[PDB]
Symmetry: C3
Subunit: 114 residues, 3 copies
């Protein structure tokens, strides 16, 4: 699984340990080993949500499987929780795009996961 | 809808008001309420288009519906127009990836749109 | 075709000429003319892969066609090889998401490729 958060929150407002917390929480949520989880945070972005530049986040989660209606609801509660608690972003100013990837469409280690 | 533009144009060349212009015109073109429109501009990028580092842009528009052949042509005319007039990027140096998202695959406000 | 690499490797570690090498080799791998290839490198990112922040990369390749199991394996070998040799990133710390785009879903030059 791989998760990106793009936000207008400043870099200094991202806590030490946030990447490790996302890794652990996503490992637990997806059930995948942490060794397979990648995370990426991009602060200081020029962005707006509903025309407003109050704190917001635009995110992506790519995973080979572990994507679906109930799972994505659970991930959204989890991830919005973390962004609210750690980055002080309101849940209603977060979007997360979920992409279920075929194994043949994810490259890694000189080949794909197929 | 969520629109991202990645460009090698420098930050100082992005005019004041541009996020607001994008929000307004995307709301009108997609028919979606402005509250649901998110926009993100990423200047100063290390990029090439056709092997050239002349001004260019690589973009993404995700939307739950309102994506299809005729709509996408319309969006491209609108967005390339804006990038040309505001950022001085030639339309033939812009790519826009359009993604029609299932409601169940978009997280927002602790849940999804499904 | 368009290729993005997000990495924690610093900007100064990206060698001169790398965008040009990526353009050339992607043109050859996809079979598409270099004039149609776009490349984007994003260094200095706040990322982790498998819980750690040694050099890693999260990438995307979007292409109208030229995507499939054998092609993607060949792209992955090529791209991991380049990231290892030029950016000193281990291949087992690289993910590449491959997206086959419909022509009507790629905007360019005020219209789409349809
Ligand atoms: Zn997406
Ligand atoms: Zn895409
Ligand atoms: Zn993707």
């Amino acid at each position: 699984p791989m998760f990106i958060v793009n936000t207008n929150v400043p870099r200094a407002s991202v806590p030490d340990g946030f990447l490790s917390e996302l890794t652990q929480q996503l490992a637990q949520a997806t059930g995948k080993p942490p060794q397979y989880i990648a995370v990426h945070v991009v602060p200081d972005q020029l962005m707006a949500f509903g025309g407003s530049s109050e704190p917001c986040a635009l995110c992506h989660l790519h995973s080979i499987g572990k994507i679906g209606g109930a799972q994505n609801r659970s991930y959204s509660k989890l991830l919005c929780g973390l962004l609210a608690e750690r980055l002080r972003i309101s849940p209603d100013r977060v979007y997360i795009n979920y992409h279920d990837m075929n194994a043949a469409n994810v490259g890694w280690n000189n080949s794909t996961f197929a």
